[PDB]
């Protein structure tokens, strides 16, 4: 019953295209239809970034079924560069949309400069340069080591002299990529809506329930997408088969899902975009 390899590669296959199609389609709608507003710069770059993470799904899926890395060293370095680099770029761009919507509600005249295209673009260049550090590290530090019979591709670290630098960089990544991004976005939303309730007709009560609705989804997405993998791959660094390596690859896909689900959330739920895309594809 090789169903388990079949189900998982399906998930990698379903998730691959929805992210690839959407992010490609979302980008090509933006670049042609709406050349820009600040939100447009964010969705495009998030799409462009979290498009390139879904590019890394074949290579990661190959190793699952094949249980080895047939693509060599140089192709392991760039894939390790691409996947790390545009995980951070997508999480950071996804987080930077988070403070952008917060700044408008709570510091409204400070939004007058934050919401300018140049401000977004300035913030939206720095954010790639920040991720670039991770991209540069993954190139040099990325390589291929023989497991025993099985070649493996990962971030190559010296294992001599009680060196736990792998657990450190997995600690380092987990807090840079998950915790302080979650806390930023979980704060900026939970604080933005407090000003909303503070405003003191039923336009508040209806809209509060509506934005609370919308807010919970993204954090529900981001939590369930990355919490199970980040928990899993840390435990694999302190300690601990066939079924476990499948549960782990299921959790990898869940992280991949956030990059495929994002265009639906951050474009198809934005009317300033959803209105435009509709025409191109509903003429």
């Amino acid at each position, epitope marked *: 019953s090789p169903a388990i390899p079949v189900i998982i590669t399906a998930v990698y296959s379903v998730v691959f295209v929805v992210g690839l199609v959407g992010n490609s389609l979302v980008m090509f709608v933006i670049i042609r239809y709406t050349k820009k*507003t600040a*939100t447009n710069i964010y969705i495009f770059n998030l799409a462009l970034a979290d498009a390139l993470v879904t590019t890394t799904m074949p290579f990661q899926s190959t190793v699952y079924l094949m249980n080895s890395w047939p693509f060599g060293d140089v192709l392991c370095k760039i894939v390790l560069s691409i996947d790390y680099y545009n995980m951070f770029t997508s999480i950071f761009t996804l987080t930077m949309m988070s403070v952008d919507r917060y700044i408008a509600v709570c510091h409204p*005249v400070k939004a*007058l400069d934050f919401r300018t*295209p140049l401000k977004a673009k300035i913030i939206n260049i720095c954010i790639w340069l920040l991720s670039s550090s991770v991209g540069i590290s993954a190139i040099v530090l990325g390589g291929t080591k023989v497991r025993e019979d099985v070649i493996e591709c990962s971030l190559q670290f010296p294992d001599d002299d009680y060196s736990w630098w792998d657990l450190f960089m997995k600690i380092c990544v987990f807090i840079f990529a998950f915790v302080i991004p979650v806390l930023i976005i979980i704060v900026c939303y939970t604080l933005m809506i407090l000003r*909303l309730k503070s405003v003191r007709s039923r336009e508040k009560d209806r809209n509060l329930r509506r934005i609370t609705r919308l807010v919970l989804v993204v954090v529900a997405v981001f939590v369930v997408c990355w919490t199970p993998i980040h928990i899993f791959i840390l435990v694999e660094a302190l300690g601990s088969s066939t079924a476990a390596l499948s549960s782990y690859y299921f959790c990898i896909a869940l992280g991949y899902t956030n990059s495929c689900l994002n265009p639906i959330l951050y474009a198809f739920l934005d009317e300033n975009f959803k209105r435009c895309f509709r025409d191109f594809c509903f003429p």
Partner: nanobody
Amino acid sequence: VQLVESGGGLVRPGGSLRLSCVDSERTSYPMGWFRKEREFVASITWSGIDPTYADSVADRFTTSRDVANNTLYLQMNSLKHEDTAVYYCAARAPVDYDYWGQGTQVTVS
């Protein structure tokens, strides 16, 4: 009832000025701005997250709404003679903009 359009006034070319229509009587929420025929500059949502920019010159203006103070702003930057016109905030029904402010004319030359 009555909307007090602040800001306005003359300015030099390439300059800036922030306009701020407000309804402190909290009767109407100014959610959009309006500027030949009537011109329609950008508007914003009630809670002030997402603005619908104005295509004409979206490289020059930004808007924001203080939800708590029931105030809508807009500060034009590096505008030209094309932007010179009368400007009036447009309010909304409490629960097809229903209330329209008297308006102020920015005059640049």
